[PDB]
């Protein structure tokens, strides 16, 4: 309720104190509740590209890193206008640190991490970070301690590293 000025804890991924508006369940615009899904770098980049191409098509009706950057710049200029410096920086950051290429690989990754039955924040971090070993991932992400077996995390990171291309 109002609660006047209520105190709150400081956010920390170690404790997973993301926030009152970053809870696991969020009420969607349709009125029902959906799990808080988080996008990894490649998945977020694909989502951005899909949104931009859809916007470009709606306006119209009404791979290598260099060519990808040229295409995204041209499409950004054609679709939207100005004041997109933050968007341009995010887009180039995503293209530079692009862990995956197309829909098939990101879909396989997301379904694999869904099969892990783990927290969306943790699986998104695992998909984004390109870790190598298991203890390295555990020390990088404190939230993964005492949640999954060491061998299972190691092997799933092995498949993720195998799926890495370019």
């Amino acid at each position: 309720r109002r609660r006047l000025k209520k105190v709150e804890e400081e956010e920390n991924a170690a404790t997973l104190q993301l926030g009152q508006e970053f809870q696991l369940k969020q009420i969607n615009h349709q009125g029902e509740e959906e799990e808080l899904i988080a996008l990894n770098l490649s998945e977020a980049r694909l989502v951005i590209k899909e949104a931009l191409v859809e916007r470009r098509r709606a306006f119209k009706r009404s791979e290598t890193r260099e060519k990808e950057l040229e295409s995204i710049d041209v499409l950004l200029e054609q679709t939207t206008g100005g004041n997109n410096k933050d968007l341009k920086n995010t887009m180039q950051y995503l293209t530079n640190f692009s862990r995956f290429r197309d829909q098939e690989t990101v879909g396989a990754v997301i379904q694999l991490l869904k099969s892990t039955g783990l927290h969306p924040f943790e699986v998104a971090q695992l998909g984004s970070l390109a870790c190598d070993t298991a203890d390295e991932a555990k020390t990088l992400i404190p939230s993964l301690n005492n949640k999954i077996s060491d061998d299972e995390l190691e092997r799933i990171l092995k498949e993720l590293s195998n799926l890495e291309t370019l």
Binding site: R1, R2, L4, K5
Partner: protein, 97 residues
């Protein structure tokens, strides 16, 4: 001229709500005052030219609203505050009808 209580009652009986609001606000005294969503008090420092709104105590700067109330209403609320009463004004419902 005095638009007394029972003139307001006659206008209510006529059902003309907007005319009553215009009589009580635009014709007499309309005051724009700023409040915050944390505490309903009017203790919001609003530097309009610099575009800076800040309620000290609540320590918020991004949760400010402006409302149009009669200056007599603002004076009544400030007098209640001076008399150790908090007439907190909120812009959303916390309870269902």
């Amino acid at each position: 001229l005095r638009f007394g209580e029972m003139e307001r009652d006659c206008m209510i009986a006529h059902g003309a709500a907007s005319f009553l609001k215009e009589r009580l606000m635009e014709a007499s005294d309309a005051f724009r005052v700023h409040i915050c969503g944390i505490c309903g008090l009017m203790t919001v420092i609003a530097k309009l030219n610099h575009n800076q709104f800040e309620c000290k105590g609540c320590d918020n700067k991004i949760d400010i609203y402006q409302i149009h109330i009669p200056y007599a209403a603002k004076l009544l609320f400030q007098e209640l505050m001076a008399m150790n009463i908090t007439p907190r004004l909120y812009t959303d419902r916390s309870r269902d009808f």
